[PDB]
Design a binder for this molecule. Sequence first.
Ligand code: S0H
Ligand code: S0H
Ligand code: S0H
Ligand code: S0H
Ligand code: FE2
Ligand code: FE2
Ligand code: FE2
Ligand code: FE2
Lengths: 193, 193, 192, 192
Amino acid sequence: TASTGFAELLKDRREQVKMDHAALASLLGETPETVAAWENGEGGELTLTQLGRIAHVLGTSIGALTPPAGNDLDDGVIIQMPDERPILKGVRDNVDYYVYNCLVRTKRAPSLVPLVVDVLTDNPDDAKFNSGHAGNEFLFVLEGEIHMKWGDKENPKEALLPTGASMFVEEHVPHAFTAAKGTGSAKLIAVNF
Amino acid sequence: TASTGFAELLKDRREQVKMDHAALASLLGETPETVAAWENGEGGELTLTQLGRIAHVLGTSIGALTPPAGNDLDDGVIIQMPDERPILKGVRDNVDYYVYNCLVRTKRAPSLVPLVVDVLTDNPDDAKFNSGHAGNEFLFVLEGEIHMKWGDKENPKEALLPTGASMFVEEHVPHAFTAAKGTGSAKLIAVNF
Amino acid sequence: ASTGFAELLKDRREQVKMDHAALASLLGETPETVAAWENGEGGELTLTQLGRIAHVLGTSIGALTPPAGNDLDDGVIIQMPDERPILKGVRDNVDYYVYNCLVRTKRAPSLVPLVVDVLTDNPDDAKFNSGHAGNEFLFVLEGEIHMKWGDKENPKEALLPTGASMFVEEHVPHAFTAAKGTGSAKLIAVNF
Amino acid sequence: ASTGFAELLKDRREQVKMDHAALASLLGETPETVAAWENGEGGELTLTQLGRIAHVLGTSIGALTPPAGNDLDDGVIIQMPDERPILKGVRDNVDYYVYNCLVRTKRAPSLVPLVVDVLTDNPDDAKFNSGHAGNEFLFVLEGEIHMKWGDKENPKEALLPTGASMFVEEHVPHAFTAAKGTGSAKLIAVNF
Ligand SMILES: C[C@H](O)CP(=O)(O)O
Ligand SMILES: C[C@H](O)CP(=O)(O)O
Ligand SMILES: C[C@H](O)CP(=O)(O)O
Ligand SMILES: C[C@H](O)CP(=O)(O)O
Ligand SMILES: [Fe+2]
Ligand SMILES: [Fe+2]
Ligand SMILES: [Fe+2]
Ligand SMILES: [Fe+2]
């Protein structure tokens, strides 16, 4: 698969840049038989570094010589039951801030990371910001009331969101969440796409 | 804005294809002063058809001569309260099938269409399929139990999903939802991205 | 254009879950008017109106208008050396280049190939541009080329003979002239 | 490569909300091993292993390896006419083309420009390829070119003189030969 895809993309690329097994090999200090081996599907044990060397000589990246993520769908769909969710308890400055209940994901859409996030803290004065992250994020308040903070960590804008509120935070925008003051905790669905 | 952006992109494009006001005008049967007018920001009343003519002569599309959607965010975010959601009641074969409660949207991410969908029907035998649609869709069961159908309308695969189940349906894949048999109705959050 | 709009408009309207009435209300129009646009009767809408329609639909005019289109003869388009447009380029008052525009296609709008005649031959009076979108491949067709790039006040430079090839990343400003006192040179420039 | 992986691996791990222990468990590795990879010590991982790591992280090997890289001198790279690679292409047992490879760059991997010597001159024995990814711009450098394209058994054709330019959409199969009995011709081919 990785090995197979590599073999195909290696040949595709070698041929688009006008090299034969010899020129490529000569260029990489390998034997034509070796390079042919790789194109036969025997490149599985090539190291990350060697793959780098190969991509270099071929004027491209490892990515362009490796296959796409692959298909994990059943006739177009994938399902996840409520009790098979992976769980990570997020700590921020030695404080148990959030609990990430990871929802369904798919190799067909790598950037889709949907989550149910338990917001453990309920003291807006102590909101712990992140530094922003790549990818846009859609949020929805599943329950309780949320105190949202965003922008500059020292002088941030704020918003109090009741159950049912929907939000969007552009990529790289730093943000932090807590339950409404004294309400203990709240919950939300977060969709990174 | 539309007028302004057009003026800028028109000049950018005219210059990349090596035309002066005259050649372009001559080519479009207009006067150099007219074409200069458009590049001055006076193209606002140009019709869709005329824009088509212009894109054609310039060997490109209207899209490439018009500005991107624009920015509607407050320092990176946009919020929607639970009671300002637009509402459309979807009818399928003269049956009130779903109720779409549209959540927050943004011109910064045009393809993001998040929704809370009330699933009105509760008779799996009468599920009304759609023919599939562009764009991938993430689903989450907010409440009740959902009876999902997908694939061929005549011989579809099925799944019974309890509250908290998350799903993904690849683009173009036809699908239909109903509440679990006899349970009356269910609800879900649907995120098209 | 009208027909493309009609189809793309309907697709986008359904995408955001809007029926004719909903869209019409937001635009101050009537549902019948929206139905007509979706029926191919939108040709007379103005650039400003289209901008408003796109805004209401949370997208761009571009997402509602059709792609450039096709102008190929089964994947191919040709251009005879005598049927090509010419543009005499002048910079700061001097015939600097002459642009002989080669084949272009609606299927790849960004492809702008050209035979450029480098008219001047004094590298000291070389006249820079200020960079441009898109990368550019160049090949010295004839004569010798004196290339300058980067900061017009602190440029990197190179003397290139016939047959030399080069790549100029987008935005990087650059300038060319024939080798000092050699009259003129020629190059093929492919912007993609 | 090792350092790029290290950074991209950490970004992706956090993205899917996985700590070192979670990732290690899924891979049957120890958290210390994962921390080392994220510390730049992943150079010895195999193609197969990387494939497994990507799978577990719901993505591709490509999303975890760094971009091609930079090889430009302030946005520009040059190639003298004498420092270019050559590949003598043979089709069905006959020297058909000679490929004189022009400048390429890691900043635009798909750009493959070339001076191609069309060696044969019998359009009847024209030898097709089977189309290829990417579009291609062509310019007749010298002599007269006889172009064929489409279905090798039911082809469209055109006789092109020096200076003619053409565009061939991706996948469209094609073949070239010098005009009947004229020995050979030459063309610049830019795949982008
Ligand atoms: C809820 C938050 O969006 C989760 P984070 O991005 O801060 O990890
Ligand atoms: C819930 C469904 O996904 C809404 P539809 O795509 O059928 O309009
Ligand atoms: C030769 C140059 O590349 C043409 P310019 O981009 O300056 O228009
Ligand atoms: C001239 C041709 O375009 C080169 P080929 O693509 O057949 O390798
Ligand atoms: Fe976040
Ligand atoms: Fe749907
Ligand atoms: Fe240029
Ligand atoms: Fe080709």
